[PDB]
Design a protein around this ligand. Sequence first.
Ligand code: NAD
Ligand code: NAD
Ligand code: NAD
Ligand code: NAD
Ligand code: 9W8
Ligand code: 9W8
Ligand code: 9W8
Ligand code: 9W8
Lengths: 267, 267, 267, 267
Amino acid sequence: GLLDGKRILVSGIITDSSIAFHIARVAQEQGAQLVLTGFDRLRLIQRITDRLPAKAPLLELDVQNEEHLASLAGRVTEAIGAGNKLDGVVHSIGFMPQTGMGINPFFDAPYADVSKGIHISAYSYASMAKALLPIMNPGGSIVGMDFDPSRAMPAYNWMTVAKSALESVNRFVAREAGKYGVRSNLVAAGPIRTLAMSAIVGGALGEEAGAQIQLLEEGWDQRAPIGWNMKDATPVAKTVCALLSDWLPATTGDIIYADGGAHTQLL
Amino acid sequence: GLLDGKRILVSGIITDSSIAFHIARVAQEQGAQLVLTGFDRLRLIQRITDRLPAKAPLLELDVQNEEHLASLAGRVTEAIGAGNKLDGVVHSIGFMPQTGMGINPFFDAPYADVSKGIHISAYSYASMAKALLPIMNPGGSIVGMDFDPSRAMPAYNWMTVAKSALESVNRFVAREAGKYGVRSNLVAAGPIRTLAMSAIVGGALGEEAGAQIQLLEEGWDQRAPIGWNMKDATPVAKTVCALLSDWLPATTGDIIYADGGAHTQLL
Amino acid sequence: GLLDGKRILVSGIITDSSIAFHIARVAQEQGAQLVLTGFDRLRLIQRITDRLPAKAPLLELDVQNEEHLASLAGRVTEAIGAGNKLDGVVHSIGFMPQTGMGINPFFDAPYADVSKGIHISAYSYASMAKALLPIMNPGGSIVGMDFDPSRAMPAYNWMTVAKSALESVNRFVAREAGKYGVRSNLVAAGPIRTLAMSAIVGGALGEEAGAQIQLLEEGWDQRAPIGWNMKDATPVAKTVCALLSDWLPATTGDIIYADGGAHTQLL
Amino acid sequence: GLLDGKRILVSGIITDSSIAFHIARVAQEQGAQLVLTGFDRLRLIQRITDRLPAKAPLLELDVQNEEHLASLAGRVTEAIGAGNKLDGVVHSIGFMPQTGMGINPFFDAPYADVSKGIHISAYSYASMAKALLPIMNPGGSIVGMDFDPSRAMPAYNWMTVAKSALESVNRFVAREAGKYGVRSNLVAAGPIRTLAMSAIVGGALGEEAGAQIQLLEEGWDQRAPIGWNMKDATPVAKTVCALLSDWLPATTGDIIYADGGAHTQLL
Ligand SMILES: NC(=O)c1ccc[n+]([C@@H]2O[C@H](COP(=O)([O-])OP(=O)(O)OC[C@H]3O[C@@H](n4cnc5c(N)ncnc54)[C@H](O)[C@@H]3O)[C@@H](O)[C@H]2O)c1
Ligand SMILES: NC(=O)c1ccc[n+]([C@@H]2O[C@H](COP(=O)([O-])OP(=O)(O)OC[C@H]3O[C@@H](n4cnc5c(N)ncnc54)[C@H](O)[C@@H]3O)[C@@H](O)[C@H]2O)c1
Ligand SMILES: NC(=O)c1ccc[n+]([C@@H]2O[C@H](COP(=O)([O-])OP(=O)(O)OC[C@H]3O[C@@H](n4cnc5c(N)ncnc54)[C@H](O)[C@@H]3O)[C@@H](O)[C@H]2O)c1
Ligand SMILES: NC(=O)c1ccc[n+]([C@@H]2O[C@H](COP(=O)([O-])OP(=O)(O)OC[C@H]3O[C@@H](n4cnc5c(N)ncnc54)[C@H](O)[C@@H]3O)[C@@H](O)[C@H]2O)c1
Ligand SMILES: Cc1cc(=O)c(C2CCN(c3ncccn3)CC2)c(C)[nH]1
Ligand SMILES: Cc1cc(=O)c(C2CCN(c3ncccn3)CC2)c(C)[nH]1
Ligand SMILES: Cc1cc(=O)c(C2CCN(c3ncccn3)CC2)c(C)[nH]1
Ligand SMILES: Cc1cc(=O)c(C2CCN(c3ncccn3)CC2)c(C)[nH]1
């Protein structure tokens, strides 16, 4: 397998439609030995991850909890065995309150909400690298999930700002990770029909936001030279595994686009 | 003058080396009628602004204070006279605690500090547009100050992340401002030897940060095809006035680089 | 006026819909003294330019003709008077054979055609700077016309490649121009309904290309936060004059977008 | 192996320091079955390729020769056997006359020289895709070599313009390749000490160009968070193989940076 013998931490599984579930599945199909991290609904996450090709220990991690982050390296070492280190880390964490995404006017998001979204979606990429770099092997890889925020778009609002902040955070994380012989990169995915994305299209964040995200999805497949299947997270999962492998050894502080090439096309 | 008859709000004056002081001076030399906003040290700001070519009313504005922002439009109207609106708005506000800039490791900035820096440096650009767009004329202009954060660099650390967030905020502010016939843009300046910049070079944020910012300054003038004089804020002030004028009427959600062309050159 | 006392060379007038006609008109309304250059149909160009606010000498310039370029500086000096130099230069020249644009497959453009298009559209920006920099004043400005080629699009085909080449040429021209205290920049305009653009929409380059350019035009106005009027070259002409003025003195090797902000927006 | 069962065409081998030699070697170590193309010195190329892990047929290809390109697909089919198609294509072709690179002033490159450089370095990427796409399998991959031309730099001059043109060509090739279920991408490598690069540093293109390329090399390793070894083409070769594999299936019309992350860092 592409990741045979590698010890990889995967955060971000919440449902069977989570991009992290598909990353975890493909990584296991490719011979990686995983450690999982889950937030708040641990009973649910264990039951979901019971469907993965192989059993993997599950650790609790709220990225807003400083105790969870301070104990994380020790908890991972206990799960993987003393003397072993991680070869890979996947950050597949993102959150923005409803005031910061959807039909709620961009000017009507209170800062406490925007700040919580930026903490979880951008700052935590640096918190996770700080916690795990001391237990990472040379030649290692840290990968985070991105949604191209180079241009403004309807409804994505403050989550776009959190992604722009995450891209900047990734470039600095690469400076730190480099001291450990570790790469840091983001995968900018095309839109994926997760449970939340389906709910948004169904009007969970207002009708106008639903209509706008449906047009974005259509335009994405139209612009993508190889097309874009929003119901298929496997091409995104494979790209994350390509970055976790030894096959992109000279790429760091960078962004790889697993979006069907849609960002390279105007129309 | 370039700005004859225009009513322009200018925030960000603190000392006679503030980029906003030079923006305010050039705007007045070009016939603009100004309203100033100042944070916390109002006695100091009044005394500084006494040196501007013309007298201008000074209003207090802490961008972290929701009462100041909610009353701002009314306070500006009282200063410019009922029935008059602003043609221009200058955001020249930036702040990052010492834990987020300098020699303090990038991983050692607490989130409360990073969040305060992002609130002042990025979110406030949207708070200011929300407050003032209802009192802005069609053909109007909102301009903010940027420092190119496209690539990571030493010491700038979390302030780089705040600038990346500000660039994203600007693109969304342009969507809102467009409804008012108003443009929103940033001026990405080359480094300017303000009081804080001189203090940093003098080691106020650690020796290594000082040495690194001195090398950045030297490299900037070297890369700039027309050179870069860090002791001269006038080219930056003129660029802000170009954006406040009627002469860039089809530019919005954008960034204009007043950096001597240094960002267009590798070496 | 914005350009009072300035001596500016303007190339690229062919009809009354030429972007250069509007640049020339606005520059004259702003007090500039112009010298014009025209290609091949000099009788037509003289008759067109008779409609400009003021009379301006017209010089012949085929950018593919080395004799025309070698004699250009001398011919300009004769027209503006010995001892006088130019403060500004406008390159508003572009051409691509029909095999390189439109419905003709991208793979079916012969290299002789692509090479002629790149010579006129990209290399000539450097030929013009070479010819005129020795007769340009410090503080001077060279401006060229661009169409954002960062992403591929239908029909534009090899002309997109010529624009990408022009952007690269501009960065090198800035290195040379800087030695003279001269700035070099491009204005990336939104689509303008020139005679050729109207002919393309009318199917002159095939039906599919017509339909595709009509969708691009519609999408441009939709994405532009301040809208985009393709029938109005005046905002583009004003942007070129802003770059020719003293008001963007720290910008070089760069691109200013006069596109209604459409490139900063995905949807 | 990463490329087990894949049929890959590799162009660009001339010496044992050619980036294409290392791409060919790594692809063979990973189980690919290769077809090679060589220009002009076929006896030399055969002798060089005798050192590759496995024997591979060698075909003559001058990308400026329309007969060579028109017969290429037939010649490849004869070498790989009727009924078999290629899964991958590597373009590792670049050339610029000495007038277009080095100490020769940027303004002193005759167009015939610049045009020959652009034909070989940029247009040929589309000529090669046109020739080989009809004999490529779905899921296939076309990869070209790039040197980041986003910013101007000393000596690279017109070759920088050819790379900017190549990036634009790649985005259009992706539109065509997508119809075949084929991806098209470039690998932007850091500087590699090939025979020509060593000759340049030794002053083959003038002393000033030598000094400037030595400073670029040093600055590259300094800026790269994981460092940059210019004497090691293996990380670049591995990146090309990552793109030729099934592990980046949603990336097209794009650029992957195998430069040690140096482009993501200012200093
Ligand atoms: N769905 C898309 O279209 C799309 C496209 C591009 C990128 N992404 C990104 O992919 C990543 C994964 O999102 P997804 O779409 O799979 O949705 P998801 O809901 O399945 O995953 C987001 C995860 O973040 C976790 N999380 C939230 N708050 C947390 C906290 N305080 N501490 C720790 N974990 C926390 C959630 O529990 C969840 O597992 C995110 O970064 C998202 O922004 C999504
Ligand atoms: N100095 C440089 O080299 C440089 C380069 C590019 C951009 N900039 C940017 O230019 C802008 C102005 O900075 P400067 O260099 O002139 O420094 P400065 O210290 O003179 O200006 C920053 C201003 O922000 C104000 N401010 C801080 N907290 C505030 C709050 N809560 N509410 C309202 N105002 C608040 C300060 O009072 C001050 O007037 C900033 O956005 C900065 O990031 C500076
Ligand atoms: N029309 C648009 O939508 C649009 C948008 C963005 C940029 N542009 C650019 O603006 C510029 C002007 O184009 P336009 O749209 O006004 O069309 P135009 O036809 O009016 O102008 C192009 C000019 O190039 C001149 N030219 C052609 N070959 C020449 C040669 N050998 N020597 C000298 N001059 C030569 C023509 O005579 C003509 O005056 C071009 O660079 C074009 O690519 C156009
Ligand atoms: N060396 C570096 O530092 C570096 C960095 C980034 C990218 N590159 C790129 O990598 C690629 C390979 O270059 P390299 O550095 O290995 O040098 P090289 O000299 O080994 O390879 C260039 C190849 O182009 C071939 N070529 C030239 N004219 C041709 C023609 N008419 N038809 C067919 N082939 C022709 C040559 O025979 C040679 O094999 C080029 O695209 C180059 O621009 C090089
Ligand atoms: C296209 C796209 C990009 C994204 O980044 C996301 C995020 C998914 C996780 N987040 C989230 N989830 C649940 C409640 C609140 N926030 C933040 C938005 C989506 C849904 N779509
Ligand atoms: C090159 C450069 C870019 C910048 O954005 C700044 C900011 C100036 C204002 N800030 C600030 N001032 C005082 C105390 C704390 N923070 C934040 C940094 C500087 C000093 N230099
Ligand atoms: C949107 C847009 C951008 C452009 O750059 C152009 C060019 C106009 C001048 N050219 C030209 N004119 C006449 C015959 C052949 N070529 C090249 C294309 C157009 C028409 N539209
Ligand atoms: C850093 C870098 C990037 C490049 O693209 C090249 C090319 C190598 C092949 N070329 C070439 N070779 C031999 C004679 C003439 N031209 C063009 C330049 C080099 C040498 N270095």
